[PDB]
Symmetry: C2
Subunit: 304 residues, 2 copies
């Protein structure tokens, strides 16, 4: 076909959730685990584990073997969400709001260890598990560096485009990068193939972020990110050519200036560039239904 | 004893594997305690346990650094929770750098530990098991810290609940310190459980003694920390005048400390702490006699002597 991508995401997400329920059961101490399972139970697009399972399939493997890696990465993601929410302080209600900050910190730390425990249950050669552990951990370190950078940007008045893109790469790209590349690691695929899936993830993630930030201008309210002063690629290119907007303390006038300077279309062109780059990296992989799903998925990430 | 030797090795590997890096903000925070220089107890237990198994304990160094990294991770997040302004002789991480950076710093140490563990020179099969066991250990420390903090607001907790909390909060990380060389080098379940049980019991006793060292001042009771002493005494219905206050008079706290010695409760702690360290030794017997094996013995002793 070529138009079922929302249905494949759905199908694989449904698998992800079924195994989430199997592997991340609520336990004692009940207060820790209710915080620990909160975000997971409120749902999630499950985009990263879905990518893992599509990548696994596109590599000619039984993608059920990739479930653990898939859920570990979704577990890492959920963990970052809990801790991140502690630091934006701003639904559903955040975990630190419902359970307090200590329970929230320990809830993230719990999910964090479980991620690795789950990944280690993978049905794959130990040498590859050890490499997947090493690689996921390095990604975790990078996400913290990305989160740190992103917060630094809140205190800065002059964030460069490349700095910002570097931030997004760690904050959003690398986790998506390893959800595409981890079945390569687990199943002994070689370096050029892992590299192709990694780049696919990173470039999808970066573009996915740019488009996400475009949706703030193209439930929640128009121009939210503007009044909250968030540095997006759009904002950064407008500043880059001295547009300087009359909100940033929490409007429709500002939004016109962003289109008028082409900063909105710069960001679109940047996000599409990233997704084309992500798709060209897939060329290394054998054509298959699953490879085309990954291709259409990159498209979806920026066309929704 | 001969620990400053391995303590020396561990800090050399720490400075080799846990470099500062960019963003310097994040790593200045993440290396703050490591540079402050803890006693490195658990790493030394890992190197000695390895040599007691008659292995090349240098091969166990990555697991030694990894467990110390976990330990430092917990310190950072714990200090956020207790809102301590200082830990031993240095300001806490959240106070110098802020709560969000403190969170990210421990989150970074946390991942760094699994990356270091995975570098081990051992059968990969056994690195996987080591990652699985250390990650469950980390889940339990979190379960413990949540238990310990839940205790604060409870009116009374039994010795059992409290001792299950100490087993998770500070014991299992000490158990896996000794356990992990048995895991890494394919010793069998008897040996693992033996080094495991030694590490846990050493932990609990080590904890009970660390609560005694505050009676050895005063802060545990003003802070309301529920120790094994105050659980015995309160089980003995000992009216304790200054347990909640935080601010207190010297005479008021002295009469509360005075009570506690005379309760038949400070004795209980030393005694109960001692029957744990002994349970560690009598467990450690499954391992062959060795300079290393007796070193773990004398070391389980040092946890009760301070």
């Amino acid at each position: 076909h070529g138009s079922m991508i929302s249905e494949i995401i759905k199908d694989r997400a449904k698998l992800v959730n079924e195994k989430i329920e199997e592997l991340l059961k609520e336990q004692e101490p009940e207060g820790l685990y209710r915080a620990a399972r909160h975000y997971l139970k409120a749902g999630g697009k499950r985009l990263r584990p879905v990518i893992t399972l599509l990548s696994a399939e596109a590599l000619g493997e039984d993608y059920r073997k990739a479930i653990h890696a898939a859920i570990a990465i979704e577990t890492v993601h959920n963990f970052t969400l809990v801790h991140d929410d502690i630091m934006d302080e701003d639904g559903v209600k955040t975990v630190h709001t419902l359970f307090g900050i200590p329970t929230a910190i320990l809830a993230g730390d719990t999910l964090y260890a479980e991620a690795f425990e789950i990944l280690s249950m993978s049905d794959a050669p130990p040498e590859n598990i050890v490499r997947a552990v090493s690689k996921l951990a390095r990604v975790c370190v990078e996400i913290c560096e990305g989160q740190f950078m992103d917060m630094s940007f809140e205190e800065r008045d002059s964030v460069g485009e490349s700095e910002y893109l570097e931030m997004v790469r760690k904050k959003t790209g690398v986790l998506i990068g390893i959800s595409a590349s981890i079945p390569a690691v687990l199943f002994g695929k070689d370096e050029s193939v892992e590299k192709a899936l990694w780049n696919y993830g990173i470039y999808s993630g970066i573009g996915f972020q740019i488009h996400d930030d475009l949706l703030d201008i193209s439930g929640k309210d128009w121009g939210s990110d503007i009044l909250e002063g968030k540095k997006t690629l759009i904002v950064i290119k407008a500043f880059e050519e001295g547009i300087e907007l009359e909100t940033f303390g929490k409007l429709e006038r500002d939004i016109k200036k962003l289109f008028d300077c082409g900063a909105v279309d710069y960001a679109r062109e940047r996000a599409r560039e990233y997704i084309e780059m992500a798709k060209k990296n897939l060329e290394v992989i054998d054509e298959s239904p699953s490879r085309n799903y990954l291709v259409e998925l990159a498209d979806y990430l920026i066309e929704r």
